[PDB]
Design a protein around this ligand. Sequence first.
Ligand SMILES: Cc1cc(Nc2cc([C@@H]3CCCNC3)nc3c(-c4cnn(C)c4)cnn23)sn1
Length: 251
Amino acid sequence: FVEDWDLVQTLGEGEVQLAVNRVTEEAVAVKIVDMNIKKEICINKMLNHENVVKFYGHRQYLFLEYCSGGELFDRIEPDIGMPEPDAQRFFHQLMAGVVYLHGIGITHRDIKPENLLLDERDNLKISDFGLATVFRYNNRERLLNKMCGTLPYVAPELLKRREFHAEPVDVWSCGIVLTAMLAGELPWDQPSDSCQEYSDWKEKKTYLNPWKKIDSAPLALLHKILVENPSARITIPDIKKDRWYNKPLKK
Ligand SMILES: Cc1cc(Nc2cc([C@@H]3CCCNC3)nc3c(-c4cnn(C)c4)cnn23)sn1
């Protein structure tokens, strides 16, 4: 009966259910797909990091690490965000996971609070590799060209360029996640000049929301992350040297 699992509840939406082993009572998340899939499983097989959802196997039923703390999305209070020290810790963990992925040549392509999960100790784990892809193989980088992601979190170069580097796109989405955590608000519907909010940011009108709600230190980091030119955008190694990133915080 050790291999017997009970589907006890739907975790959300294409469906993710919580499964409990009838013997050990161990919990796991089961991604059910009707019946791209082969790629997801393959990519999942390469993953082994504390801030990345673990893959156990597949029977389609993808057996993955269950995160009891739910989505980071649910820890963000509308119009408020969350305490700065909590945001910083989640950000550190997100960067750790992203550094790991980039280190193995994998780009997530859809980083957003709905995909960042929390374990029993509120440790952040990057989930869902359904849109992920290889951007580096045999030490050679491949440029991306496919439209992937979620508008409010997507980097501007996806909409303006035929080809673009993978890493700066994930960095940008991490910057939008940080903004959400600190302001409880997404800055724009999409990173296009047609969105007044995006133009306002490029004109540095930081006296407006959501920027006005964010302290100068993390805001200085956002100024380096949310840079339109991906080639001028801060890289992860430099984010790790940022003043706010290294600021001791405590509630
Ligand atoms: C208390 C509690 C815990 C939850 N836990 C929970 C929620 C969700 C949602 C489902 C809807 C989309 N956003 C993520 N996905 C997962 C996964 C998981 C692992 N790999 N993948 C692909 C998903 C593991 N736990 N988990 S939800 N409520």
